[PDB]
Predict the structure.
Amino acid sequence: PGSQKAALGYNILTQEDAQSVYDASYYGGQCETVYNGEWRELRYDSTCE
Amino acid sequence: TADLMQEWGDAVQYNPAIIKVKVEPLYELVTATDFAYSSTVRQNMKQAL
Amino acid sequence: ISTIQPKANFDAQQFAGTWLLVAVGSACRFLQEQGHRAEATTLHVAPQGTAMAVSTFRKLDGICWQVRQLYGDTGVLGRFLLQARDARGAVHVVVAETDYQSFAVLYLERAGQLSVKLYARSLPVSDSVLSGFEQRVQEAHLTEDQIFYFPKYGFCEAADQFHVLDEV
C-alpha cells in the first residue's frame, strides 16, 4: 500500500504529482515479497475467548 | 509509562532493529562456485571499495 | 447443535450490567493450546434497543482490554447475531438460561461451531448452578475435559482509550 505514489512523476515548479512514470503494478513474473513488521492486528474469537 | 514500554518491547519482537552488526565486505561473496574470473572480480572489488 | 430455547422472557434491561465469566467448555483448541494463563473475563451488558452493546473487559499481559461488541437482536427474544466484519463468521448467541441478579448460561455458535459459557454476578457461585452448567455441557455433548474454569480474581474495568477494540 502506498507504493503507487513512488511511481508518480514530480513537478519541481509546482511540487505536484504528475502522471505515473514507473509501472506501479508490474511484477515481471517475479514473486519478491516484503515482511510487513506491523502485521499484528488484534482479533477476539467470542466463541473461544 | 512502564505499560507503554512493555507494549513497545513486546512489539520489538516482530519488527526489531539491528543493534549490533558484524559485517564482511561484499567481495567475500564473489566465489568461483558462482563466477568466472572470481579472483579478478574480487581484486577489482577491493580496489573499487 | 441446536437452537435450544432462550431464557423464558429474556430481558436485556435485567440482564444489563456486570457479568463474570465462571467457566467455558468448547473444542476450540486455543482454550487448551496455550490454554494456560486464561485471564479473568467480565462483561458489562448495555441494552441497545433489542440488541445489547457488550464490553468484555480482560487483561492481556496486564494490559486491560475492553472489547465492544453488539449482540444484535435476531428478533427472537434472547437470540442474538454477532455480525462478521469479515470475521470468520457471525456468531449466533442464545441466552439459554439466566437469573438476572445471579447467573447466565450463554450458548454461542459460529459456522456450526458451538460454545457454552457460565456467567455470574458474584465471585461466589452456588455449586448448584455450576453443576447445572456441567449438566448442560453433557447435554451439549462436550466432555467435562473441555471445561476451562477462569481465575477468580484480577478482573479489570474501564480499559484505556487505547486498549479498546471498538469492534461493535
